[PDB]
Amino acid sequence: AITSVDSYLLSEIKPRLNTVLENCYIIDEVLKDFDYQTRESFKEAFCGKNAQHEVTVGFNFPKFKNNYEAHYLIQLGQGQETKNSLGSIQSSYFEATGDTLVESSTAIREDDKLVFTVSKPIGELIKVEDIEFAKYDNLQVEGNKVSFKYQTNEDYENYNANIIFTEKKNDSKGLVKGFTVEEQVTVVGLSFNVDVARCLDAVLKMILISMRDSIEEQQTFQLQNLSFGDIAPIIEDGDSMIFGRPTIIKYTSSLDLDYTITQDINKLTFKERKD
């Protein structure tokens, strides 16, 4: 599973940043240490549902003009290989598996079992929220749905559960070959007003903190490290300077490829010899 850190960063940042800027309480919590003036100015400009001004995020070298009132700029940076396993072997799988999904699913009644439906089939069930099925419940997964004994659990006929599971792709089996890569990605906020840049950097730090609970980087992009540069004038040739403070984010991910195996043994030929 080749990793595109930049796209993941963008997808995590955009909705999360919009949600954070949606409400004032979270912003006030974030900007507790800042002075009244800059805090209130940033809140007036960008914060709130009905904010007239808006921030943006995008990759570097855009052929079009880019808004320099407040923008998050991303560039890919360097990368390095840090650790390897014997034969480049990372893991072995019997059934092809895709991404790990989290889905909410209300309990349902079936003639012998309570069940939960899901969007897609199941390759493996990791966890059901606040449940530890015993032998009596006889937890079974049958494609799309997971099921447990009806009678002794009948109080929970409409349990508002949620599920963490894994997609199923194929029944084939193979080996995972790959290594670990230690990658650096640079993120910088741009603004002709330095105070806006400072507040933007603080918001960036908070959303990076919040991201650590995300499933994907919990499973794929562990060992997050941060590093901040100095406030510098990005450009001097305009009528007014652009000010930005670059930040460097580090991640560790496992670049890997699935090598299928067609060998399947189903018969044995134990015979003696004579001389």
């Binding site: 320099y68 305009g238 009528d239 007014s240």
Partner: peptide
Amino acid sequence: KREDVIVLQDPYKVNDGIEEDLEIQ
């Protein structure tokens, strides 16, 4: 120097009620 990085609207000039290209007799 041109104004690209920061743009402000045209200034609010006070208008005059004299019609332009006004006939006189």
